Amino acid sequence: PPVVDTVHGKVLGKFVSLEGFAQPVAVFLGVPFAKPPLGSLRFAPPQPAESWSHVKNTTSYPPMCSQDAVSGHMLSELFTNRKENIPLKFSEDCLYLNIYTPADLTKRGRLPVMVWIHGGGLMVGGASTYDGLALSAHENVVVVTIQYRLGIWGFFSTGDEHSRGNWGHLDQVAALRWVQDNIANFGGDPGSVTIFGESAGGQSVSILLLSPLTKNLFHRAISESGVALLSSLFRKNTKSLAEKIAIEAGCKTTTSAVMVHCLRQKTEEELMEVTLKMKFMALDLVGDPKENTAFLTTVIDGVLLPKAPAEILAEKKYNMLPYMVGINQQEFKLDQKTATELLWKSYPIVNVSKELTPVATEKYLGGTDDPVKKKDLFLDMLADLLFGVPSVNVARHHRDAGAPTYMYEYRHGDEIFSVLGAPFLKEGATEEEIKLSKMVMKYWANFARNGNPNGEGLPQWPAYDYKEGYLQIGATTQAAQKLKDKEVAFWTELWAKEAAR
Numbered sequence: 001p002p003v004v005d006t007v008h009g010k011v012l013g014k015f016v017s018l019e020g021f022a023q024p025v026a027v028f029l030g031v032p033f034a035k036p037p038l039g040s041l042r043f044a045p046p047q048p049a050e051s052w053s054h055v056k057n058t059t060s061y062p063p064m065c066s067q068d069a070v071s072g073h074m075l076s077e078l079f080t081n082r083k084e085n086i087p088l089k090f091s092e093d094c095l096y097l098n099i100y101t102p103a104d105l106t107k108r109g110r111l112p113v114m115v116w117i118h119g120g121g122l123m124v125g126g127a128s129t130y131d132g133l134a135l136s137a138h139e140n141v142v143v144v145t146i147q148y149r150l151g152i153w154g155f156f157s158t159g160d161e162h163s164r165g166n167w168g169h170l171d172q173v174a175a176l177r178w179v180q181d182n183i184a185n186f187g188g189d190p191g192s193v194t195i196f197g198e199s200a201g202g203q204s205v206s207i208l209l210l211s212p213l214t215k216n217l218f219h220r221a222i223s224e225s226g227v228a229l230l231s232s233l234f235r236k237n238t239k240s241l242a243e244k245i246a247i248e249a250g251c252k253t254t255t256s257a258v259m260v261h262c263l264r265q266k267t268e269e270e271l272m273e274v275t276l277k278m279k280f281m282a283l284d285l286v287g288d289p290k291e292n293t294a295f296l297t298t299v300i301d302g303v304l305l306p307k308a309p310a311e312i313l314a315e316k317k318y319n320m321l322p323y324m325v326g327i328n329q330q331e332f333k334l335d336q337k338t339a340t341e342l343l344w345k346s347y348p349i350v351n352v353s354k355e356l357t358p359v360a361t362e363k364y365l366g367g368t369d370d371p372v373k374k375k376d377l378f379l380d381m382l383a384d385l386l387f388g389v390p391s392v393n394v395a396r397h398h399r400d401a402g403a404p405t406y407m408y409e410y411r412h413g414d415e416i417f418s419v420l421g422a423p424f425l426k427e428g429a430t431e432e433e434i435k436l437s438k439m440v441m442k443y444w445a446n447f448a449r450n451g452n453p454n455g456e457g458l459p460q461w462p463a464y465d466y467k468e469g470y471l472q473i474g475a476t477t478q479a480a481q482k483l484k485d486k487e488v489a490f491w492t493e494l495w496a497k498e499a500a501r
């Protein structure tokens with residue numbers, strides 16, 4: 001039974017042997033990296049954890065952050081890269097991380113560290129549904145899954161000092177700081193930390209890469225199907241949102257301070273209650289697509305983000321380091337009038353003026369294949385809009401700044417089956433995807449230790465220079481070029497025409 005020291009006290013983990021590997025993996029589940037964000041700490045930045053004198057049992061999955069348990073239980077079942085489906089528990093006391101290390105705790109391990117940031121619209125998700133027991137064993141790295149406040153708890157902002165916002169992101173920063181001051185005890189190398197995640201995790205890594213407060217907290221980043229440029233997860237301000245939330249809770253809105261103070265008085269159940277009423281994770285068709293800003297989000301707080309992401313990216317003066325941006329052509333039938341309507345209704349999620357709406361349709365869903373079955377093109381443009389286009393834009397920005405860049409197209413969650421090696425400790429699928437998994441983890445890890453995904457036994461992966469070299473992964477893995485170049489062109493131009501209407 002492994003007992004490791006930490007700045008705050010000792011933790012007791014457990015050994016797990018993965019068939020096919022000589023060395024066990026030491027696992028620590030539910031290690032606190034902060035003080036429980038209760039009472040006055042709700043809607044505040046994370047405070048350090050108080051020290052403890054006993055040896056802390058860390059062999060049990062910590063609870064996940066307050067969230068929609070139905071949407072939370074479902075996303076957890078559809079993303080677990082294991083066979084067992086963990087018995088979830090939710091609480092505001094959710095600031096914990098899980099550690100998977102293959103290092104020999106008896107020695108001075110200096111293995112690269114990979115910190116996984118789960119996705120889930122910043123509304124749901126947890127670190128436990130992900131298992132680094134395979135990636136750590138297969139690639140010889142230390143894997144850390146972190147948790148962060150979600151929904152109201154994590155992103156409620158009044159646009160000023162009484163509740164700046166981005167608590168969820170400040171929790172990610174705190175875990176990264178924790179890794180710095182402690183991972184060495186687990187055979188991890190704080191000098192080689194790689195942050196990675198998909199969807200909302202993907203954009204979080206992007207946000208963190210652009211934040212002034214992450215200097216030296218990590219050394220490489222991987223965004224999968226999500227970048228700082230997602231219009232759904234960022235908004236310069238959310239005062240009106242904060243007000244709708246305060247009212248739904250039965251709080252006055254006289255001031256920012258009165259709002260926050262009243263909300264701090266609410267109960268987790270009461271706030272959970274408001275969350276459900278607000279109906280965040282869901283598209284609202286009826287009404288005007290511009291009044292439904294019911295989406296808690298990343299904002300400009302002058303702390304994590306001094307200014308909007310688009311601009312910080314433009315200034316080219318953020319944390320310059322290896323960044324791997326990738327996507328999966330999937331979000332996982334109708335006519336051109338109804339589809340074009342769904343686009344307008346999906347305004348909050350994709351911000352596409354009604355004016356434009358038809359154009360995009362008649363372009364993607366254009367007068368090519370009139371069939372209804374072949375309107376899966378809608379789902380393609382809807383993806384390019386969500387992450388496809390933004391990703392490339394983010395990449396181009398990074399490259400254009402002189403930072404090692406890389407892209408790839410896997411052929412939401414599926415890459416995860418490969419990234420965390422589901423094909424081993426799960427159902428047992430196509431011996432074909434099982435090798436696909438090993439190839440993936442290989443790139444991620446080589447990138448983790450070198451900032452270059454390349455290695456022996458793996459097809460060439462071109463840097464993301466000006467030839468737009470990117471890797472194509474799937475049943476057959478090859479290299480390609482100009483990812484979403486045509487799609488980006490049509491949009492950057494379309495949105496150009498209305499630059500001076």
Ligand SMILES: *[C@@H]1O[C@H](CO)[C@@H](O[C@H]2O[C@H](CO)[C@@H](O[C@@H]3O[C@H](CO)[C@@H](O)[C@H](O[C@@H]4O[C@H](CO)[C@@H](O)[C@H](O[C@H]5O[C@H](CO)[C@@H](O)[C@H](O)[C@@H]5O)[C@@H]4O)[C@@H]3O)[C@H](O)[C@H]2NC(C)=O)[C@H](O)[C@H]1NC(C)=O
Pocket residue numbers: 231235310311314315351352353495
């Ligand atoms: C909902 O839909 C609308 C319309 O489709 C979205 O459009 C935009 O609204 C703003 C209109 O004013 C745009 O931002 C402004 O215009 C351009 C953006 O291209 C900027 O040049 C403007 O000023 C910036 O100031 C900083 C100061 O440090 C400079 O560094 C900037 O320079 C670069 O940064 C911009 C960032 O957008 C880049 O495009 C270029 O590399 C610039 O060279 C720049 O001088 C000003 O920001 C935006 O493009 C866009 N959104 C906003 C409000 O910024 C709208 O965004 C969308 N809303 C939602 C829900 O997302």
Ligand SMILES: *[C@@H]1O[C@H](CO)[C@@H](O[C@H]2O[C@H](CO)[C@@H](O)[C@H](O)[C@H]2NC(C)=O)[C@H](O)[C@H]1NC(C)=O
Pocket residue numbers: 012057059060
């Ligand atoms: C550490 O925590 C574990 C889990 O909470 C404690 O033992 C329990 O978990 C085991 C599985 O790991 C089960 O097999 C046991 O049944 C269960 N305990 C009971 C009630 O039988 C364990 O006591 C704690 N102490 C240490 C340091 O191991």
Ligand SMILES: C1CCN(C2CCNCC2)CC1
Pocket residue numbers: 231350351352492495496
């Ligand atoms: C014009 C081009 C792209 N946008 C926008 C369009 C829709 N909102 C998010 C990106 C900013 C300015």
